[PDB]
Every structure is written in C-alpha cells, then in structure tokens.
Amino acid sequence: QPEPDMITIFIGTWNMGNAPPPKKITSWFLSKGQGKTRDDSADYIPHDIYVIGTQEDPLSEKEWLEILKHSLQEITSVTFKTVAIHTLWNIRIVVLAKPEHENRISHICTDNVKTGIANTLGNKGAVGVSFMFNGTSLGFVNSHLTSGSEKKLRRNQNYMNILRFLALGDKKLSPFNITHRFTHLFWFGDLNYRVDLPTWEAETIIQKIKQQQYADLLSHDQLLTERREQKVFLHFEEEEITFAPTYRFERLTRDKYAYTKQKATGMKYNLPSWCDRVLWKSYPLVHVVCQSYGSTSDIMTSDHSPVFATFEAGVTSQFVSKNGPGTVDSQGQIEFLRCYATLKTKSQTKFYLEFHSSCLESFVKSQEGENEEGSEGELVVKFGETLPKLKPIISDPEYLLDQHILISIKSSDSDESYGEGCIALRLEATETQLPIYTPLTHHGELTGHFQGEIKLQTSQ
Numbered sequence: 224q225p226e227p228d229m230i231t232i233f234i235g236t237w238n239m240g241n242a243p244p245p246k247k248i249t250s251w252f253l254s255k256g257q258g259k260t261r262d263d264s265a266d267y268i269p270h271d272i273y274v275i276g277t278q279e280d281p282l283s284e285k286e287w288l289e290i291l292k293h294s295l296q297e298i299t300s301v302t303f304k305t306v307a308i309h310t311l312w313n314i315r316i317v318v319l320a321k322p323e324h325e326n327r328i329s330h331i332c333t334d335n336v337k338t339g340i341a342n343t344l345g346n347k348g349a350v351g352v353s354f355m356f357n358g359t360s361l362g363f364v365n366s367h368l369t370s371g372s373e374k375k376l377r378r379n380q381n382y383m384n385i386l387r388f389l390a391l392g393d394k395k396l397s398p399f400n401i402t403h404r405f406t407h408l409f410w411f412g413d414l415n416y417r418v419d420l421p422t423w424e425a426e427t428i429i430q431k432i433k434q435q436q437y438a439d440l441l442s443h444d445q446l447l448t449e450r451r452e453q454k455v456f457l458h459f460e461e462e463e464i465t466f467a468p469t470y471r472f473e474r475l476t477r478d479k480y481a482y483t484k485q486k487a488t489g490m491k492y493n494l495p496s497w498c499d500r501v502l503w504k505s506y507p508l509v510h511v512v513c514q515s516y517g518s519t520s521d522i523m524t525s526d527h528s529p530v531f532a533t534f535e536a537g538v539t540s541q542f543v544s545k546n547g548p549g550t551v552d553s554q555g556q557i558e559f560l561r562c563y564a565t566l567k568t569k570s571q572t573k574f575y576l577e578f579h580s581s582c583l584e585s586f587v588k589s590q591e592g593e594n595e596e597g598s599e600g601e602l603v604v605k606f607g608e609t610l611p612k613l614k615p616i617i618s619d620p621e622y623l624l625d626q627h628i629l630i631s632i633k634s635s636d637s638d639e640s641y642g643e644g645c646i647a648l649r650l651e652a653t654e655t656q657l658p659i660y661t662p663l664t665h666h667g668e669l670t671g672h673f674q675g676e677i678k679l680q681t682s683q
C-alpha cells in the first residue's frame with residue numbers, strides 16, 4: 224500500500240451567526256455554489272483531510288462533530304476520524320481525516336490566541352491545529368478578526384498578534400513563528416475585511432453583485448489592498464474571488480443583503496463584503512494548487528454564507544536509510560557560498576545565523592558575520608565562505624531535494640531573531656553553485672533579505 228506524494232485538503236470557513244445549521248450542509252463539503260466550484264464527477268471522491276473553521280458557533284463540540292461526520296459519511300460512505308477539535312469562545316476548528324491516514328498523522332498540536340485588551344478582549348481571536356502527515360508538516364488557523372468597516376488597522380494588529388503568539392508545530396523551531404513552521408499553512412476565517420466604498424453606494428454595490436460584476440468591488444476590498452501595500456498577510460496566497468460577497472445577508476434567503484444601520488449592529492453599516500476568506504503559505508517549490516474557492520448558495524441560517532476552498536498539496540514519505548535517521552549520511556552536504564543578509568535595522572550588534580531543518584540532527588549556529596554599510600543606508604552582514612557545512616541525516620537525492628532550510632539571523636548581544644526565511648533544496652543541479660534567496664521577516668513583517676549561493680551534494 225504505497226505512501227501518497229499528494230493529498231487533497233478541504234478548508235471550510237463559516238460564521239454561523241449564533242444559529243444552528245440547517246439539516247443539509249453537504250453543498251459546503253462538495254464545493255458547490257458560486258465561484259470556482261468542484262466538478263460533479265468528483266462528488267463521491269473524499270478529500271484526504273477536512274478542516275472546518277466556524278465563528279459565532281452556537282453548537283457544542285459533540286453536536287457539531289455529529290453533524291460534520293454524518294455529512295461526510297452521506298457524501299463519501301466513509302466514516303472520518305477526528306484528528307483534532309479546539310474551541311475558543313464561539314470560534315472552532317475541527318480536523319477530520321480518512322481512516323487510512325490515522326497512522327500517517329502524528330504530533331497533533333492545538334492552541335488559541337485571544338486578541339484585544341480590556342473592552343476588546345473576550346470574543347475575537349484564533350484557534351489552530353498542526354500535525355505531521357508522514358514527512359510533511361501542516362498548520363491550520365481559523366481566526367475571527369475585529370469587525371467594522373473602519374477597523375482595518377485593528378484587524379492587521381489582530382493578525383500580527385495571532386501569528387506571534389499561536390504556539391503550533393515544532394517548539395524546537397524557537398526563532399520561527401507559525402508563518403515558517405509548516406510545509407503548508409492554511410489561514411482562514413471571518414477575517415472581517417470590508418469593501419471600502421461610501422455608504423451612499425450600497426444600492427449601487429447590490430446592483431453590481433446582481434450583475435456578477437465584482438471587479439470594481441474587489442478593487443476596494445480591504446484585504447486585497449492591505450496585502451498589496453504589505454500591511455498584512457505578507458507572503459500568503461489567495462485564489463481569485465469569483466463569488467458574491469458572503470456578508471451581510473438577511474437570514475433564510477440569499478436574495479437580500481442587509482446593510483443598513485440598526486441598534487443590533489451598533490448603528491453601523493455592513494456594506495456587502497468578502498468577510499470570509501482562505502489564504503495559504505507553502506514552503507518554496509512545494510506543490511500546492513487551489514482546486515476550488517467559492518461560497519454555498521443553499522445554506523441560509525446565518526447572515527454569512529459558508530466559504531469552501533480545496534487544495535492539492537505535495538507530501539513526502541517518512542524516509543528511512545541504513546544511515547539516518549539516528550546518524551548523519553556523510554555522502555550528503557550543504558554548502559553556502561558568498562552569503563549576505565541585508566537588514567532594515569538601525570542596530571549595530573554583530574549577527575550570527577541559525578540553520579534549522581528536519582534534514583539535520585539539530586540546528587546549526589554560524590560564526591558572526593562582517594557588518595558593512597550599504598550605499599542606501601542599510602546594514603549588510605557578510606558571511607563570505609565562513610558558514611558551517613551542514614550535514615544532512617540522509618544523502619539520497621529523492622529525500623534531500625525535497626527538504627528546506629529555515630534561516631534566522633540573530634543578534635549576538637540579545638540572541639533575538641531580527642529575520643527569518645526559508646530556502647528550498649529543490650535545486651536545478653547538484654554539485655553546482657546556484658543562487659539562493661529568501662526575504663527575511665520578523666513578527667511577519669519584512670526586515671531584510673538573505674542571498675548567496677548553495678552547493679548541494681547528494682549520494683547521486
């Protein structure tokens with residue numbers, strides 16, 4: 224029974240509006256409705272993993288698990304196993320997997336982050352799950368960010384707090400936040416970004432939606448504009464949106480957007496918006512393809528419509544050789560030539576690197592680099608040919624070319640990371656000097672770059 228080199232992953236996000244769901248929600252898990260939808264010919268083919276994020280969820284865990292499992296069994300005739308479930312207030316994540324995957328899944332972590340302070344602490348935040356699927360690390364975040372059209376900067380702050388403080392994945396990756404811990408990270412939820420057009424334009428917006436003309440609305444979507452300005456979700460992907468705004472609907476129909484201010488809304492307008500989103504970030508040169516991104520049309524208990532996204536994701540085996548794991552395989556090596564970091568910092572500490580990878584027995588600390596002044600007022604840290612030769616546990620190119628090296632640049636004075644990035648070993652050639660590059664981030668914001676050359680020796 225061979226180990227897979229690809230799986231499919233379903234991501235769902237639904238703000239349930241504190242109401243129980245209707246009796247049938249299968250259209251969600253089938254990726255049917257509006258947008259990029261799934262072909263009918265796939266309806267009986269189960270996804271490998273289903274990840275369900277809810278917000279304003281009124282159900283108990285037991286109640287929602289029974290609905291989800293009975294839904295999937297009706298679609299697929301498969302009884303899914305529960306990998307994890309975690310709830311913060313009314314924000315919930317459920318991970319279900321095909322029973323054949325049960326002994327491929329390990330290292331299951333859950334965590335939550337509560338956002339805000341005083342007034343604004345008590346209902347917004349995020350839940351997450353991570354695990355290993357054979358050789359591949361997977362992370363999932365469901366966040367309910369701050370509401371309201373004039374609070375985009377709050378939402379961006381909520382995002383930074385969640386990625387800083389959510390504790391998922393391998394704790395030995397101490398310099399790295401969740402945006403670097405996983406082969407594939409999926410971040411979804413009621414992100415609550417709005418279409419920023421004047422209140423007076425509400426009926427104009429509604430008209431546009433009825434004509435399926437979304438371009439002049441998407442050009443004002445706050446998530447797209449904040450991402451384009453590098454204010455949030457740096458280095459994440461999102462599929463093109465081709466479905467109508469998923470908020471705010473009159474309940475029990477989808478014929479009406481309920482946008483006008485009411486006491487129940489704090490006298491705020493809710494112009495039609497794409498509140499409900501799925502984004503992802505995968506390591507460089509790993510296969511990930513979005514195969515659906517859309518909203519259901521027939522689930523109408525909430526003022527939001529459910530959103531679905533599905534992905535093909537590359538996965539790798541749990542590799543064993545005669546040598547590693549448990550020793551190095553001295554037919555493998557990783558060399559860095561002519562490497563330098565460019566940092567936005569004003570500081571003048573010396574810096575050193577750490578190299579982290581599950582292809583190493585443990586992380587590797589470099590010597591301090593040589594600081595120079597860049598022409599345009601930057602710090603350039605030169606490592607030259609001074610960097611330690613990395614000794615992978617396995618030399619087989621079928622394993623080693625699929626790996627990645629995480630890099631942190633740390634202050635000698637504080638041991639704090641000033642920037643994190645990732646280099647793929649999926650090279651065009653072995654035993655050949657080749658350019659490498661990663662941006663560097665800290666707390667998910669750009670802090671610099673790392674570039675140089677690599678030389679990879681495998682057993683072939």
Ligand SMILES: O=C(Nc1ccon1)c1cccc(Cl)c1
Nearest residue numbers: 304305306307308320324325328
């Ligand atoms: O123990 C598991 N899941 C849960 C969640 C709540 O209680 N048990 C588990 C462990 C490994 C693989 C799988 Cl498919 C499931």
